[PDB]
Amino acid sequence: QYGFQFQKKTTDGTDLSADQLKAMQFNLTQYSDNSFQQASKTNAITSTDLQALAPGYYGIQEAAAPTGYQLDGTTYLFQLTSDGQWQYHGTKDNVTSGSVINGQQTLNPVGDKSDDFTVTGDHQQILTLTKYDEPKPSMTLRVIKQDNQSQYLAGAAFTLQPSAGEAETITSSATSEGQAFATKLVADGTYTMSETKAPDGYQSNPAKIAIQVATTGKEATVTIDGEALKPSKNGYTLAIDGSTITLQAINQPLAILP
């Protein structure tokens, strides 16, 4: 009994299923003519969902990809026929003549991975289109531990406290390189950086770094203690070389009493 389906896939290789169907949305339209100019019925359909189709003209599109991968607004067109053959007519960009889908027609690709309508089923009466999602733009946060004397310092913890998931503590290297955290910085995610511990005999820095990522995935929303700055306030320095916000921290030799 003729039906349709879509498995969702990640180029990152990232198996995100926790909050994938979270905001993931897929619209199937049932177009009236092969022209696809006019849409008679339309309705949502999910990863786990198989939906009977009478013969007709039809588009499949994503209107909401899961949080942290950008939408491919592309509507892929196809057709089921009175006989039982599945064809393929392209995108509402450029509407193809309609080529019978025998086994598979490769589709528009996102990165290395490429989408394809693939015809399973005993009587080959089941179209499944795999939609690859491209992992959304990401940030990298790197830290450089620096004393009063411009001398690199190590054993200086700096904790990355995210909104959710494991909080991460790097220990600073005494390197011009420094240290970047094990946890890349999500778009539309919110985080706190604080000196986890003073490096032994230097003064603690109590003030907390706030970093908020825009839905864009390059965003500069950061307000340590009370306020925010243009990229050294509070001995905290920020440097942006695109993908990476880097922080350089000057410690204070603990004030000593006779």
Instruction: Decide the pairing of beta strands 126-135 and 3-5.
Output: parallel
**How far is residue 108's CA from residue 130's CA, in Å, rounded to a whole number?**
11
Structural tokens at position 150:
């411009």
Residues 46/21, Cβ–Cβ less than 8 Å? yes
E-assigned strand segments in 74-121: 75-80, 90-91, 104-109, 114-120
The torsion angles phi and psi of 8, rounded to 5 degrees, stand at: -95, 145
Experimental method: X-ray
E-assigned strand segments in 95-242: 104-109, 114-120, 126-135, 140-146, 157-162, 168-171, 179-180, 190-194, 209-212, 221-222, 236-241
Structural tokens at position 237:
């320095």
In 3D space, the residue among 193, 188, 190 whose CA is nearest the CA of residue 142 turns out to be 193
Angle at 101 between CA 92 and CA 51, to 5 degrees: 75
Residues 6+ apart with CB under 8 A from 73: 61, 62, 63
Chain breaks in the chain (C to N over 2.5 A) after: 231
Angle at 250 between CA 244 and CA 254, to 5 degrees: 145
The torsion angles phi and psi of 148, rounded to 5 degrees, stand at: -60, -35
Structural tokens at position 3:
């039906």
**How far is residue 161's CA from residue 35's CA, in Å, rounded to a whole number?**
53
Helix (DSSP H) and strand (DSSP E) numbers for the chain: 1, 21
For the stretch 210-218, contacts whose Cβ atoms lie closer than 8 Å and that sit 24 or more positions apart, written own/partner, are: 211/141, 211/185, 211/245, 213/139, 213/185, 213/186, 213/187, 213/188, 213/189, 214/187, 214/188, 215/187, 215/188, 216/137, 216/187, 217/136, 217/137, 217/138, 217/139, 217/187, 218/137, 218/139, 218/242
E-assigned strand segments in 184-235: 190-194, 209-212, 221-222
Header resolution in angstroms:
3.4
Residues 6+ apart with CB under 8 A from 107: 76, 114, 115, 116, 117, 129
Strand order in the sheet with 39-44: 39-44, 25-31, 56-64, 75-80, 90-91
The torsion angles phi and psi of 71, rounded to 5 degrees, stand at: -70, 130
Structural tokens at position 55:
């013969």
